[PDB]
Amino acid sequence: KGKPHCSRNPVLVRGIGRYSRSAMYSRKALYKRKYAALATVTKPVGGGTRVVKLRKMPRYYPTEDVPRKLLSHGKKPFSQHVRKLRASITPGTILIILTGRHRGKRVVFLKQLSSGLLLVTGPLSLNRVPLRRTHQKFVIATSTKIDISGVKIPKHLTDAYFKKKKKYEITEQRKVDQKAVDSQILPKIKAVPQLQGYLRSVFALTNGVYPHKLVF
């Protein structure tokens, strides 16, 4: 025994290492670390005691059946996938929700969960939008970034706690999660020159006013 060390070549590009395999002979201390060369159970019963077996054979076979698959190369499930982002999205920037019962609304970003969804948080007060998830792809990012360095963002509000149950009702658990996550946010939006007439109002298209041209 002798605890497990970290890898001794820094990663240069995916697949490729850094230090070549005679010079890397050095670093795994190769030269100086040479070497050379369940079934059944027996319980008591009321002279005799039985021999029981764990996993006995089945009592119905089926008449026809499928055969085993060829193993795929490198196919992990969702849980183990790798999560990304975009450049414009950073913590505290301004997001435009574009799809649900809230659509066109100006909504603030807080923290990307480990399911990969966002946390698009309206300050329930102003818009009418609470703690919620939305999905990278259906959310435009915007150039405005009031900072969210110094406040507090809770842990227990993790991605399963949101996941659905079954007149769903707002219990007394999601009311100190509601006003305490947002009253740390609320002293930094009103302090900017005239920003709480804009998160409340809705954006939309008119004419002369084309998606492909303008910056937002």
Binding site: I140, V202, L205, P211
Partner: protein
């Protein structure tokens, strides 16, 4: 309190003078007039919206007239503003010179 899609007009099938292809359309997106301009629109969802005699059920509403064909913008076409498309349901030619909506959602901003 307003619109959330961009207006455009189905303007024939993909084709050359004497044989027409029906699995690709040809949209004229509004106010977009070169190639340069048409990166935005690529991949982005699109809709032909219409209205039969009987009731179709919906998601998020009551069972009423209104239905859709759904699709997809694929690549640019020509020199001048135009764009190709690929709906799941092959379009009517009634709709030639009538409205279709390109959306904003699968955005890359």
């Amino acid at each position: 309190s307003g619109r959330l899609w961009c207006k455009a007009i189905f303007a024939g099938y993909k084709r050359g003078l004497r044989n027409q292809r029906e699995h690709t359309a040809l949209l004229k997106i509004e106010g977009v007039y070169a190639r340069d301009e048409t990166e935005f629109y690529l991949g982005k969802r699109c809709a032909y919206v219409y209205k039969a005699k009987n009731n179709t059920v919906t998601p998020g509403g009551k069972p009423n007239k209104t239905r859709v064909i759904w699709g997809k913008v694929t690549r640019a076409h020509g020199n001048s503003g135009m764009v190709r498309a690929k709906f799941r349901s092959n379009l009517p030619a009634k709709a030639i010179g009538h409205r279709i909506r390109v959306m904003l959602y699968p955005s890359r901003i």
